Amino acid sequence: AVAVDLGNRKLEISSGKLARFADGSAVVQSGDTAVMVTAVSKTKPSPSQFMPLVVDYRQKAAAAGRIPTNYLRREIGTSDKEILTSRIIDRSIRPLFPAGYFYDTQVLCNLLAVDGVNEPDVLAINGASVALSLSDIPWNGPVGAVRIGIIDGEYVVNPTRKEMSSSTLNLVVAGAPKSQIVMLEASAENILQQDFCHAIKVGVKYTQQIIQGIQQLVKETGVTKRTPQKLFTPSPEIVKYTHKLAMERLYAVFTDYEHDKVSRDEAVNKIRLDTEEQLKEKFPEADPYEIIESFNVVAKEVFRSIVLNEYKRCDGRDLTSLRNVSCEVDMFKTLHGSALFQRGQTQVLCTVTFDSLESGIKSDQVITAINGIKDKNFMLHYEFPPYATNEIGKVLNRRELGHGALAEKALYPVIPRDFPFTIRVTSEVLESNGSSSMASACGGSLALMDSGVPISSAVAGVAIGLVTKTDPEKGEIEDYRLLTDILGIEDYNGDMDFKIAGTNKGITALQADIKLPGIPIKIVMEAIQQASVAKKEILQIMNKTISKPRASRKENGPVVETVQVPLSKRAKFVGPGGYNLKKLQAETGVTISQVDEETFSVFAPTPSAMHEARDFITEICK
Amino acid sequence: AVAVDLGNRKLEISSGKLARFADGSAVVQSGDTAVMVTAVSKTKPSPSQFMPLVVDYRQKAAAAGRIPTNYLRREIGTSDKEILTSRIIDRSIRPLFPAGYFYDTQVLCNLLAVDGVNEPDVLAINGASVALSLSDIPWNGPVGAVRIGIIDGEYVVNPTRKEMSSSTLNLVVAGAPKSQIVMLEASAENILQQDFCHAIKVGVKYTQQIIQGIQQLVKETGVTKRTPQKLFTPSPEIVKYTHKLAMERLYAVFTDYEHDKVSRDEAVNKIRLDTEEQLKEKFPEADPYEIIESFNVVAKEVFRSIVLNEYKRCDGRDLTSLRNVSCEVDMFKTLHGSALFQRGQTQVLCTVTFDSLESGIKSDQVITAINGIKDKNFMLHYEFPPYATNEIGKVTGLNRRELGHGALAEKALYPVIPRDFPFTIRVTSEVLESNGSSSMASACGGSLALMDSGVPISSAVAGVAIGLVTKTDPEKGEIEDYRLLTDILGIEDYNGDMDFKIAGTNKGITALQADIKLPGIPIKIVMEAIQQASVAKKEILQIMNKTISKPRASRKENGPVVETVQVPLSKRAKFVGPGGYNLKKLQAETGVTISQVDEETFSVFAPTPSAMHEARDFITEIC
Amino acid sequence: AVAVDLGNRKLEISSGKLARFADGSAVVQSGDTAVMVTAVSKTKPSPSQFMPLVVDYRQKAAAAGRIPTNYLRREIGTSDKEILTSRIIDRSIRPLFPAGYFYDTQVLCNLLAVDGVNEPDVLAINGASVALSLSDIPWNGPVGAVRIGIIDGEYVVNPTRKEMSSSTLNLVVAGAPKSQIVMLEASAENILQQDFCHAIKVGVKYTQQIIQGIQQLVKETGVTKRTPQKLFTPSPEIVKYTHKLAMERLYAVFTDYEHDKVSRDEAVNKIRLDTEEQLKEKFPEADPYEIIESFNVVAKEVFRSIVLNEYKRCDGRDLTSLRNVSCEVDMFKTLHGSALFQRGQTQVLCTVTFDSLESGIKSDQVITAINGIKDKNFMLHYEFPPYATNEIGKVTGLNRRELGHGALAEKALYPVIPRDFPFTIRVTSEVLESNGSSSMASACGGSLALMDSGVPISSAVAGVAIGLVTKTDPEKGEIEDYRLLTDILGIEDYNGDMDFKIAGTNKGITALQADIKLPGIPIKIVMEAIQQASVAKKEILQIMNKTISKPRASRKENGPVVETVQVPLSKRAKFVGPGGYNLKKLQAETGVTISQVDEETFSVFAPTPSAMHEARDFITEICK
């Protein structure tokens, strides 16, 4: 039992009492909120040729504490808050696993109690670190996680629910030993870059105190890490031979600036086919997967050496240049708003649909409390069809759900208040070669302006890559390069996917997907600054297509007006138990609600829809 | 780009702007409705050893694009309209794929915009043809698809949404080059055969103009086709050896008229097992699947040669002869209506249940509008349990075949359903055993159970399936001669060329679903199939009328009742309860349904008079 | 069409008309309720090296046939009643399958008609018996299933729905020939042990009449059984060789009394790894699984021979001794009630949370509320997370075992739940560690949490699992001698013959579920299993009573509050909003549940006093 003090909060960490059969277990308590996290890792190697790691964060109360149970009454599935928290925990712990740890691993978070004051999502990240630290699963140093908010200009560590609602910043920082950063996830109300950068430095300082406390608990209880059967990494002898065979051919492919996505991959695949054939001959007894991974290591090394040595990217761009950006609005007449955003070979179609206010709340209390009503009546739906990458796939996706929330909070600060309709932005990825999620914010802002929503300002996002050269002995970063508007290959062979969105005068969202086991804080600051100048250029291009919201909504847009029905005719109009109202609203598409005993409010998505419902009302009234 | 004129309708086809990463892509626009269709096919052969093609039609908003539904995809799943459209698109494009194309193919439909006037489902079929034509996926000639309706006695191509509501016919025709019909799917309000035949002729002519427009776009684009890694067809020399080995054994089995479904299947399996081993020794290098498929080619060829040369089926009857038909009603006392229909070795148990009119609502706006409210408060649920074929399979969820077969039988029985019936009519058809057209048997059995239940339907409805066996030379590819078979068995559909299901009353046609496996068939074959099915439908209706010819004068005594109760407004607070909790509690415990009509009156629906009996007790026991 | 007379009830069994393609099919009718059951078994051995038997029970309607269920999504298989009924049928027929019958088998039940008077679930078990009897699927003897209830002190066979609503006992007995018992499932209203045991005796007598009727139809029809192409029992010569190689090593492991669950398994697995790499060399031609099952046969025999000959268990306990029991209460301040029950290495955390009476139990769609309501506003949820066994599992997806265990523990605690409680009582049982009867630990832990919440229950409920190890000659098949084990471990259940989970108060029996793995056990063994469990239950209740003996005088101060607030009729339009939008919004941002009582007042349920603080300032703000 080790206590950690963070300014004015307490973090009680304990182990050895509950769930003693799991490989690792821990209980993290702040105030009256307790979360127990367990870690289980199979001893046998996994058949899958990667690191199978799943994180499941389960809650029992929907609206924190207030709803008693969602699991007892509704087994229908996992909300988006549970999925998002699982992704944040997964991002914080995955980089610290050793390379080649091909073993099935599950991290489960069980919310023992919640007081409705201290949020359990932050304690769940720390619980995963403590459970993995005390376990025998091979894992690197402990990770501390805090949430930084800004209330009345002051930075608050782990703000309560009451303060979180009044905060202009919602930033979560996961830090490694030596003040490294392994996870960043923020949503801000268009705050300045200077305020945003200060909060990151404050957060990393607080996570070091948690790491010191966890290391103390690891010292008290004897922790002996297991020895895995074998770590699945290609042998240096095989990797060296692959470098001799295919360095020149791979170098020529990556120095050929005429390649597109499909031709670059085909050229690399042709080298892979030839090299793997002679690799098996040289090593007849080698693992078949070891041949595949050895080529991927050599190809990644060759790709990264060009950026570091020559400052030239595989498509001929320099470190700061953007890809070609094309914008378009008013694609189809019947849509309330539309926009087609193109960035290199990434195409995104964004649509804006207006709906009734009542569409937010559905199906009694528990269902509408599992997924709470959005603060402003505005949600974003993200789709990643299989053909976006020329693929076959079945049509709950974790990546697509997470990207939708990332783009939704990027556009959230500029959405106006008290809009007379629900705003539903649908972002569809038609072609994928880069940051389609960031293109959803740019295209979503264009479609919002085209639909007539009076947003405060345009929102643009970009992804910043990173290529580093780490010393094999010290482990420190000798030198690094930051890339603007990375491709798919640069993200695949890079060290991070630093997606950040915002307006021209502020920052609205950030999601750093760091693949390295921690990066220095100054690299994060330079990534924010590099993306600041890249965002200005993108907003310059988008403003040429459209610079301000349209004066009025489209003529074929939704209408809302009241209809008066007498007391005598209400029985016939509503029908037996509201059957007539439910029948009319189901075929003509309108939504009718009673505001009082006399007047009803009718919402029709199109003027034609209201025309049908208007004659239907009058014929009953006569 | 390329525009095609269809009467007063204008069609636009374009490509090269959206989804450029897919193997094929196209945008088909009619009016303000735009649909984008993509085709993706893998280059590595799939281990499934068949055609893994899957079509997923998707709509972003229900109720003619008025109520968005894309966001609740997680909590809703796929609607029935989307599944039915996917089956129609699959039927139109599957027969044109080359034989042995065992590569994972998926076709996606993305409704870019819908204006609530032009239906996007027909444009989706056309988009699938253009996307495949422009792609490098090996696919035969383009397919045009139109919808034909009959409004005020005139034939309309691609009618608007408000035009099909007043239409007596809803027919979708997919055509291949040279006026060959690929897919047929219709649902008419008991229209004459001559009117039905004329609409098909008009539709095929309209699809030819679409094909001509698509071919122009293909030539302009400059499409080149990939060379597949391998086409998994058996070697001609392997089939020649297999034919010599099992020609006589298979001939004797198919000429034995004492066989049933099970005994015939195990008889050909005995020859297959013996031939399998001998083929392996002769051709050790041959693939394990190549040996299996070669026997299937020989068995299919021997099976068809008997029909073509001798005009006799495997079970001994002639081309126009039906199998034994037996009917029975009122087997169980407590069922509102019931019927047991037997045709050959196919047995279907049909049950009729009367529910409240409020059961058609799903209590929430979006989900209710996703599938809509039934037109006559009539629905049909079709169940195909695994024991119908002596098989083991999961029963969770609803597969696409069950959904499609339920809508087909529902469309067959829809025109005769009366209007303003005081209850929701639910028909459940369970295939107890399957050897033939169970979906058509659900139409016949459903009609019998509807009359037994006491619903005053206009006329009895019967449905039959028509097979087809054609001889085609590989040199050219046109049909030389053909045989049309009445009431085909499972082996005759499996080894046949089409599954021509059609139902109707004695003086009209109500539903049709042609499932053609050939790459198009002449229109004259379709006309003959409709005529041959009308004769068989008359024979089946003759047998059914002996069991029951008119609906019962009234519903069964144990049937549902509707009553109106009076509660004073002061009493309403404690009778209804806090938030209606008392009413909801009485609903689940007893089974009755109470709906407020006005301030004092409450309408009560009880499935049984006994269930009603314990409902007035609750009303009076208060105070 | 053989008819069987069971007192005043008539049972009609027919075959040969419907579903003739299936391997076996039968129709069982009682009154106006008819149930058709089919059985299909594949003739090709399954790749999975066990018996893949699945039973699916489907009802076309809910609320005893009043509400049609099909026409809806969520198929038909998944439902509270349907999953439990499938579990009852599965346990009635599973023990009678031959050993080594690794063939895919499915049993399906279709409710042809339901009259709302006779229960189709009992007919479904008999239908599964007839369908398997008439099929060519190798099955060992028909079984008969009856339901026994006590209505006015008299015992009623197959009670109607009206009689079950007034019955103090809900017992289902499945009997094999020669008066054996295959399945027991009871839900008693805290009845006396002598009355409970008499009902079992009466039930077994009635099942013998059904077996007599089924056997008449089998001979009349002329059933002939198939010959499976292979039975996967290990060869006698390999099993005897594994015995000579691992008997001494396994004997030392099971006589080592300092082993725990994990250490014992690793010690056994060490012997398995060393023995298997010697059996393969001795029999290079042996099937790979035949080696695996040969070691399992030897290990199971050695484990059972110790308790038979020495009366000593693997952990040093005697036959009637319990494991260590530890209990804690109110470990977390914010929970309405909590308890941490520990039994040996089995650890269960139980939580009690109150709910709004109305919105809690009533679902959104009144049609979708097929399991409409619990008689008392009380239900239990059982969770078996994968880390309870140090495993990785599907955290989602339907779990039949989890559903069955939740209803079993809920049945145990139901008779002591008070009536007309202001809130919906929801008990959560989470198995943090599992080494035995976590289901019965949920009964004891749930009892402690209920008293800690202030719920005035009548008495404390304790449960226990009784195992059994028998000696049976292979020449004939009778039981010579046997041992009954109190509070069995996981290994004792795995290598045992029966998992006799029974719960009750200190003066009665509330629930029972006998998981008999043998092809029937004598009525005598069941009698002493109940008596032995009575002694163990009293010992457990004394340990729990030390932690807490009576319910708290009041609920926790941070518990739910229900009180009304007056809303003027002139302000009703603005407060409720357009079509109840404002009430839905307020009830979603906060946990407060608002229900309109009359035209001027609204009843407000608040989960916490702070929740009503937020709600009160929200409504008063509207008043301006």
mmCIF file of C-alpha atoms in Angstrom, chain A residues 76 260-262 328 331-335 340 342 345 347 349 351 353 355 359 362-364 371 379 381-383 385-397 400-401 424 426 428 430-433 571 575-579 581-583 585-591 605-606 608-609 612, chain B residues 17-24 27 29 32-34 36 38-42 54 56 58 60 63 65-68 70-76 104-106 108-115 161 357-358 360-369 372-375 377 584 595-598 603:
data_model
loop_
_atom_site.group_PDB
_atom_site.id
_atom_site.type_symbol
_atom_site.label_atom_id
_atom_site.label_comp_id
_atom_site.label_asym_id
_atom_site.label_seq_id
_atom_site.Cartn_x
_atom_site.Cartn_y
_atom_site.Cartn_z
ATOM 1 C CA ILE A 76 -26.621 -4.851 -25.250
ATOM 2 C CA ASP A 260 2.389 6.699 -56.098
ATOM 3 C CA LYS A 261 1.084 4.595 -53.208
ATOM 4 C CA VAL A 262 0.200 1.487 -55.213
ATOM 5 C CA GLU A 328 -14.892 21.294 -53.110
ATOM 6 C CA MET A 331 -21.416 18.251 -54.460
ATOM 7 C CA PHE A 332 -25.094 17.243 -54.508
ATOM 8 C CA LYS A 333 -28.227 19.362 -54.454
ATOM 9 C CA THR A 334 -30.337 17.418 -51.951
ATOM 10 C CA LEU A 335 -27.702 17.292 -49.200
ATOM 11 C CA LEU A 340 -14.994 16.691 -50.841
ATOM 12 C CA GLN A 342 -8.445 15.747 -50.978
ATOM 13 C CA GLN A 345 -4.151 10.358 -52.247
ATOM 14 C CA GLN A 347 -10.099 11.578 -50.263
ATOM 15 C CA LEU A 349 -16.535 12.983 -48.458
ATOM 16 C CA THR A 351 -22.012 15.402 -45.389
ATOM 17 C CA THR A 353 -27.572 16.405 -42.035
ATOM 18 C CA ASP A 355 -32.233 16.322 -37.516
ATOM 19 C CA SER A 359 -33.425 12.380 -32.084
ATOM 20 C CA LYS A 362 -34.034 7.457 -27.492
ATOM 21 C CA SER A 363 -35.433 4.266 -25.987
ATOM 22 C CA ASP A 364 -36.148 5.034 -22.336
ATOM 23 C CA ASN A 371 -24.408 7.193 -24.457
ATOM 24 C CA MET A 379 -22.179 14.400 -33.436
ATOM 25 C CA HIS A 381 -19.890 9.698 -37.635
ATOM 26 C CA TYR A 382 -16.716 8.347 -39.243
ATOM 27 C CA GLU A 383 -16.646 5.540 -41.810
ATOM 28 C CA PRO A 385 -15.013 1.434 -45.998
ATOM 29 C CA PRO A 386 -12.891 -1.529 -47.127
ATOM 30 C CA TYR A 387 -12.584 -0.126 -50.657
ATOM 31 C CA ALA A 388 -10.821 2.974 -49.299
ATOM 32 C CA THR A 389 -7.695 0.784 -49.306
ATOM 33 C CA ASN A 390 -8.831 -1.678 -52.019
ATOM 34 C CA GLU A 391 -9.688 -4.362 -49.480
ATOM 35 C CA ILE A 392 -12.334 -6.934 -48.592
ATOM 36 C CA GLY A 393 -13.818 -6.525 -45.131
ATOM 37 C CA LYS A 394 -16.944 -7.332 -43.177
ATOM 38 C CA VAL A 395 -19.268 -4.373 -42.681
ATOM 39 C CA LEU A 396 -18.003 -2.753 -33.989
ATOM 40 C CA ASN A 397 -14.768 -1.252 -35.325
ATOM 41 C CA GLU A 400 -13.325 3.864 -36.839
ATOM 42 C CA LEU A 401 -15.120 4.659 -33.578
ATOM 43 C CA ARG A 424 -24.859 15.126 -37.841
ATOM 44 C CA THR A 426 -20.918 11.990 -41.757
ATOM 45 C CA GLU A 428 -16.608 8.822 -45.393
ATOM 46 C CA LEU A 430 -13.109 7.062 -50.159
ATOM 47 C CA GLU A 431 -9.313 6.871 -50.513
ATOM 48 C CA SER A 432 -6.838 6.331 -47.675
ATOM 49 C CA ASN A 433 -3.138 7.165 -47.910
ATOM 50 C CA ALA A 571 -58.398 12.074 -29.764
ATOM 51 C CA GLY A 575 -55.058 7.948 -32.246
ATOM 52 C CA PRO A 576 -55.331 5.063 -29.788
ATOM 53 C CA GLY A 577 -52.272 5.362 -27.570
ATOM 54 C CA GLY A 578 -50.554 7.679 -30.024
ATOM 55 C CA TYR A 579 -50.855 5.142 -32.835
ATOM 56 C CA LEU A 581 -48.995 10.024 -34.659
ATOM 57 C CA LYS A 582 -46.488 7.164 -34.685
ATOM 58 C CA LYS A 583 -47.943 5.916 -37.976
ATOM 59 C CA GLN A 585 -44.178 9.952 -38.457
ATOM 60 C CA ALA A 586 -42.976 6.543 -39.687
ATOM 61 C CA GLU A 587 -43.993 6.834 -43.360
ATOM 62 C CA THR A 588 -43.699 10.549 -44.190
ATOM 63 C CA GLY A 589 -40.493 10.990 -42.177
ATOM 64 C CA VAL A 590 -41.603 13.955 -40.048
ATOM 65 C CA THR A 591 -41.345 14.113 -36.246
ATOM 66 C CA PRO A 605 -36.330 17.210 -43.024
ATOM 67 C CA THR A 606 -37.557 18.588 -46.375
ATOM 68 C CA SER A 608 -41.874 18.251 -49.440
ATOM 69 C CA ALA A 609 -42.077 16.077 -46.320
ATOM 70 C CA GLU A 612 -47.390 15.616 -47.180
ATOM 71 C CA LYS B 17 -13.500 10.971 -59.470
ATOM 72 C CA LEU B 18 -14.338 8.976 -56.322
ATOM 73 C CA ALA B 19 -12.757 5.893 -54.730
ATOM 74 C CA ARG B 20 -9.929 5.689 -57.251
ATOM 75 C CA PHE B 21 -8.152 3.037 -55.155
ATOM 76 C CA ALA B 22 -10.832 0.388 -55.730
ATOM 77 C CA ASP B 23 -10.540 -2.043 -58.628
ATOM 78 C CA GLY B 24 -13.702 -0.572 -60.120
ATOM 79 C CA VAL B 27 -21.406 6.836 -59.930
ATOM 80 C CA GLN B 29 -27.199 9.396 -60.993
ATOM 81 C CA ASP B 32 -30.884 14.148 -57.700
ATOM 82 C CA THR B 33 -30.233 10.589 -56.456
ATOM 83 C CA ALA B 34 -26.587 9.527 -56.753
ATOM 84 C CA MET B 36 -21.539 5.077 -55.993
ATOM 85 C CA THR B 38 -17.216 -0.122 -55.959
ATOM 86 C CA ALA B 39 -15.894 -3.569 -56.862
ATOM 87 C CA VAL B 40 -12.879 -5.122 -55.133
ATOM 88 C CA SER B 41 -11.452 -8.539 -56.004
ATOM 89 C CA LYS B 42 -8.387 -10.185 -54.490
ATOM 90 C CA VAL B 54 -20.602 -10.828 -51.366
ATOM 91 C CA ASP B 56 -23.526 -5.244 -49.249
ATOM 92 C CA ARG B 58 -26.123 0.181 -47.646
ATOM 93 C CA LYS B 60 -27.657 6.096 -44.935
ATOM 94 C CA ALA B 63 -38.004 6.495 -45.092
ATOM 95 C CA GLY B 65 -33.803 9.408 -47.076
ATOM 96 C CA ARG B 66 -35.734 11.475 -44.532
ATOM 97 C CA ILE B 67 -34.646 9.908 -41.213
ATOM 98 C CA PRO B 68 -30.860 9.409 -40.876
ATOM 99 C CA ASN B 70 -26.096 5.772 -40.291
ATOM 100 C CA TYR B 71 -25.081 6.580 -36.708
ATOM 101 C CA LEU B 72 -27.061 3.714 -35.121
ATOM 102 C CA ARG B 73 -25.375 1.117 -37.341
ATOM 103 C CA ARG B 74 -23.749 -0.265 -34.185
ATOM 104 C CA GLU B 75 -27.058 -0.698 -32.336
ATOM 105 C CA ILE B 76 -29.319 -1.646 -35.288
ATOM 106 C CA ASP B 104 -12.760 -13.058 -52.902
ATOM 107 C CA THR B 105 -14.949 -10.358 -54.459
ATOM 108 C CA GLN B 106 -16.983 -7.693 -52.676
ATOM 109 C CA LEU B 108 -20.219 -2.053 -52.054
ATOM 110 C CA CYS B 109 -23.030 0.450 -52.601
ATOM 111 C CA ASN B 110 -22.720 3.967 -51.167
ATOM 112 C CA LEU B 111 -25.798 6.189 -51.456
ATOM 113 C CA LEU B 112 -24.177 9.586 -51.958
ATOM 114 C CA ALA B 113 -27.542 11.368 -52.100
ATOM 115 C CA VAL B 114 -31.246 10.517 -52.230
ATOM 116 C CA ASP B 115 -33.947 12.993 -53.253
ATOM 117 C CA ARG B 161 -41.604 6.842 -55.418
ATOM 118 C CA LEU B 357 -52.397 -3.150 -34.314
ATOM 119 C CA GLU B 358 -49.907 -1.435 -31.980
ATOM 120 C CA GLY B 360 -46.323 -3.030 -35.618
ATOM 121 C CA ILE B 361 -44.716 -0.043 -33.882
ATOM 122 C CA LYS B 362 -41.258 -0.464 -32.342
ATOM 123 C CA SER B 363 -41.862 2.260 -29.679
ATOM 124 C CA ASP B 364 -39.052 4.455 -31.063
ATOM 125 C CA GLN B 365 -39.084 6.683 -34.122
ATOM 126 C CA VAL B 366 -35.964 5.586 -35.989
ATOM 127 C CA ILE B 367 -36.211 1.800 -35.655
ATOM 128 C CA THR B 368 -39.912 1.883 -36.539
ATOM 129 C CA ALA B 369 -39.081 3.834 -39.702
ATOM 130 C CA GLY B 372 -41.578 0.774 -41.820
ATOM 131 C CA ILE B 373 -45.122 -0.244 -40.948
ATOM 132 C CA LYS B 374 -46.661 -3.085 -42.938
ATOM 133 C CA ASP B 375 -49.156 -1.926 -45.547
ATOM 134 C CA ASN B 377 -50.720 -4.921 -41.025
ATOM 135 C CA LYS B 584 -47.019 -1.512 -18.132
ATOM 136 C CA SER B 595 -54.056 1.874 -24.902
ATOM 137 C CA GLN B 596 -55.738 5.134 -23.959
ATOM 138 C CA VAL B 597 -58.254 6.261 -26.584
ATOM 139 C CA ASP B 598 -59.656 9.370 -24.878
ATOM 140 C CA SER B 603 -58.972 0.064 -25.389
#
